Design a protein around this nucleic acid. Structure first.
Lengths: 103, 62, 94, 77, 46
RNA sequence: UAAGGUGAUAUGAACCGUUAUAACCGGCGAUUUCCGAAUGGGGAAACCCAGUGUGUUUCGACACACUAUCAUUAACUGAAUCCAUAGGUUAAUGAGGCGAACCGGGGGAACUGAAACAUCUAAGUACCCCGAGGAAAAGAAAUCAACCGAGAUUCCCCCAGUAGCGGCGAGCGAACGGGGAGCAGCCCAGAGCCUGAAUCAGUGUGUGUGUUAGUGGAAGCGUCUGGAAAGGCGCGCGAUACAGGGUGACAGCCCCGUACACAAAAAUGCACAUGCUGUGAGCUCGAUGAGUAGGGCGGGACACGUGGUAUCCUGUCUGAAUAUGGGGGGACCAUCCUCCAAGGCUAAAUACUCCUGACUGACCGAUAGUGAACCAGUACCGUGAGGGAAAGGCGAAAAGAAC
RNA sequence: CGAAGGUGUGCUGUGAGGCAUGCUGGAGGUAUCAGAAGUGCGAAUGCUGACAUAAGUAACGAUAAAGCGGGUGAAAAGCCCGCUCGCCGGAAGACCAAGGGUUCCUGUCCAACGUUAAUCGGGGCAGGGUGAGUCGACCCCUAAGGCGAGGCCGAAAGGCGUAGUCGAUGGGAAACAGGUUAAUAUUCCUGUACUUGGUGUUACUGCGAAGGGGGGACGGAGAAGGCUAUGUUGGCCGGGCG
RNA sequence: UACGGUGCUGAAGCAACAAAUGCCCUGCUUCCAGGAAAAGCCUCUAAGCAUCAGGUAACAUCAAAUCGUACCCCAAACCGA
């Protein structure tokens, strides 16, 4: 019963990247997702001789609260909320708006 | 693997158990050296043995 | 007569160190880490079976664990049993 | 322990009251006595540490009885 | 100057050790007390 | 129940897993080193040393079980001593130890007050000991009452700071009676008839209802400030859900939830329903608890300090009647009333919280609140019993500052 | 479009106080009228923390004593190497017990610790290191003493104590010399030994204890005599001729 | 020659004297204050067993487990903050 999953395309409700869109890369146990291209930070990576890392200002993706994102309904062209229902003895997610199953 | 191993005799089971243990030992020997570059194997095998042990206890007096 | 399972569980590891290397090269003596509960005869039996090599004798000793300090917190390392196993003349071990 | 075996009389605490009513804790010991009792049925003497009152009881009832009660109580004699 | 504490392991154990505490009632109560408190080292025993 | 996982400081490595034996959660199992009642003997706890038997051996040794004490019962055996008994060896069953408070019993202070102090008080308190239960204890009138009557025990409010007690000081302090909570009565002292009649406990089965994982669970957009909107300003919608928490500032409609509606393969509590095992109900005839009641001496308990002191208990010495009898009605006698001691059992209303869950607070908010918001009964101190701290906050996010 | 808190300013009330506002601060505050209090601190040789003073003052822990050259280093009175000097030598040397518990050795670092500096350290971090039939414990035996089946005694708790069982500081089998590690050695290696158990043997033939006996098994002081450890001298061997 | 050391090599290796508080000595002499215990060890038999076991005899083989072993130890490591 987790509304947002690894490979869902989502849209951001809040923050500096609000309105933007992206595929979820992975979701954390802490209640945070990392989405592709959305929340970017320019970490100063410390060089290390071992592991073949040179060291520089790497721009990587920082996590974002799940609440802050929303699963995008391609049909409506908008963010929607997710509900759960049993179809053929199997739980499936659906868009509250327009009531269509997520596939 | 428990369901597969359940369909066996006692003598069989004992042999595999021994075979698991010998492996374990080999891995331990490798691990101490710089040979073993697959650590999960140790974990696996230990679990495998415990499973067998369980299957022996179930068979004999349960 | 020692049970095979027990034998397998005896031997923890080879011990690498300068002294150990010297013992290997000169006196034909291997230095093993073994179970703390493992007695000498047991160790010998296990050597013979699992490395397939004749044993002259086993000396053992108990290594006490060092007290260390991780940050502010004190903590002690485990004690463990060392075994010098002298192997019969002409016995070459892999 | 100073206990009549027939009656169960133990020591009990109490006071010495002086003429000036100065209470001081005291005991009251029973009048115990170890006595051989002839048991006519079994034909042997049974020793019993027992109070004069216990004696009187025995006399009244019969030693055999007393022994039975005691047995019931789970006491050795 | 000979100071009061002149350690001796055996003497320590006999006096204050676990088994000594176990032997008598009062010692057992002490042990129980210490357990209740949450003492890590229940006794002098190393 | 699942698309994410392999606890944490704490990353990484090597890996697993994605529609179902990955991981996670719950039931029932398995394993469960050593010390510890510790129980084969010993011991400076976490160690030392056995015995016996059954099996195996590559014959060097392995394995695994049993071996405490006491009580009780049974079997065999068995002295002085003829029989016996004591004793002895086996076997079975139970116990042992730990644990907050509450409960019953065995013992039992002093400081203090009395403006000193001894009776008295503090107080049957503190404490020590034994025993038990989820509660315990008590309990079915040899009770009150007053010539009317009540009808076992327990607890609450009155009666009443009254009557009393009291170096008549300091202080202690009822009862009768009334209002409530809750209410239940039974058996043996013994034999006849009838024979399985109510009730209780253990134990299976069935039903209901919990508990131990869970499932679904409404409705919002635009714009301005701003690092960020949940804020402002607009216009909407849900509400058996505006409890609460989180989300980059304050969110009913972003998330988790909440109301509401559903859920258990398995285990299990409590109700009834039912089978089995033990138990005996109703009827007639009786019988009706002796070193006991009373008494003397000494103590103690009763609000009651021996006093004019009834009543209860008994260390000591005595010692009835036994229903045509006996107990009590606060010295004692007479009359009347009232009850039936010297054998037992018994739910409820009552007491407490080590512990579990839920919810609440004109309670604290880091010198407070637990000693302890933090790896605290730790560090440290002490031979030991024992004592016993300090120490919370970057940021929304490490983006924790490459060069 | 900036809350509390902090810090200035201005105004204001008879006072405790109040109002406004600049900066800081970055999220809470709260009128009014009522309500309740852990409601107001300068003192209690009050408590807890912080920071002063004396003061850069006293002191730097035996009056056994240092000097130089070279090295390393960011830096050398203090570290390493060298040569002198000085101190102990029935100890200030060597080996153990007890007690400690890694302080041992190697590499590395110098914040803190070291009464200064520190490249050094018994400091930090990492790694390494303790080898036994004959040493010791364990083990057999017991002393003082402890526990103590039954038992005797005791309100309870418990006390004493028999049989027993524990208890060394005492009794009881066996190893020496050399060599070796950075760090262990009667433990490793080299050589040369010993012990007491089993098991199997052939040979023989009275074995057998919870019992009997012997032994173990024992004081102080004194006196010598015989010895060795050890030392001195000579001889010998090697080197030397200042 | 990594200036730490490593490998090879190696003469003589006798005598006298002196000499312990150490050994013979758990002895001897003496004194009164009159000087552990038990086992190991030797030996004697009893119940027993009886031509078996057990004993001693050499010889062969196996065995000796476990724990401690670093370092300080009149001290900078123990008792004294």
């Amino acid at each position: 019963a987790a509304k947002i999953r690894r490979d869902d395309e989502v849209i951001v409700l809040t923050g500096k990247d609000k309105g933007k869109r992206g595929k979820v890369k992975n979701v954390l146990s802490s209640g945070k997702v990392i989405v592709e291209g959305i929340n970017l930070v320019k970490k100063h990576q410390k060089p290390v001789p071992a592991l073949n890392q040179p060291g520089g200002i790497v721009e990587k993706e920082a996590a974002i609260q799940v609440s802050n994102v929303a699963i995008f309904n391609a049909a409506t062209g908008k963010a929607d909320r997710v509900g759960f229902r049993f179809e053929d003895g199997k739980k499936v997610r659906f868009f509250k708006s327009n009531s269509e199953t997520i596939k | 693997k428990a369901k597969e191993l359940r369909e066996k005799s006692v003598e069989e089971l004992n042999t595999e158990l021994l075979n698991l243990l010998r492996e374990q030992f080999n891995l331990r020997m490798q691990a101490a050296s710089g040979q073993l570059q697959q650590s999960h194997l140790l974990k696996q095998v230990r679990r495998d043995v415990a499973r067998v042990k369980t299957l022996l206890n179930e068979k004999a007096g349960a | 007569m020692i049970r095979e399972e027990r034998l397998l569980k005896v031997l923890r590891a080879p011990h690498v160190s300068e002294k150990a290397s010297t013992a290997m090269e000169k006196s034909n003596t291997i230095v093993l880490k073994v179970a703390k509960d493992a007695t000498k005869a047991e160790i010998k039996a296990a050597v013979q079976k699992l490395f397939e090599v004749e044993v002259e004798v086993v000396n053992t000793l108990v290594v006490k664990g060092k007290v260390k300090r991780h940050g502010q917190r004190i903590g002690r390392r485990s004690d463990w049993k060392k075994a010098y196993v002298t192997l019969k003349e002409g016995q070459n071990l892999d | 322990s100073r206990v009549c075996q027939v009656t169960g009389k133990r020591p009990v605490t109490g006071n010495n009251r002086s003429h000036a009513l100065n209470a001081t804790k005291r005991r009251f010991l029973p009048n115990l006595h170890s006595h051989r009792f002839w048991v006519e049925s079994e034909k042997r003497f049974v020793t019993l540490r027992v109070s004069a009152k216990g004696m009187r009881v025995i006399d009244k009832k019969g030693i055999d009885t007393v022994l039975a009660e005691l047995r019931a109580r789970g006491e050795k004699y | 100057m000979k100071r009061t504490f002149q350690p001796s392991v055996l003497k320590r154990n006999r006096s204050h050790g676990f088994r000594a505490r176990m032997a008598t009632k009062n010692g057992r109560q002490v042990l129980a007390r210490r357990r209740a408190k949450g003492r890590a080292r229940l006794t002098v025993s190393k």
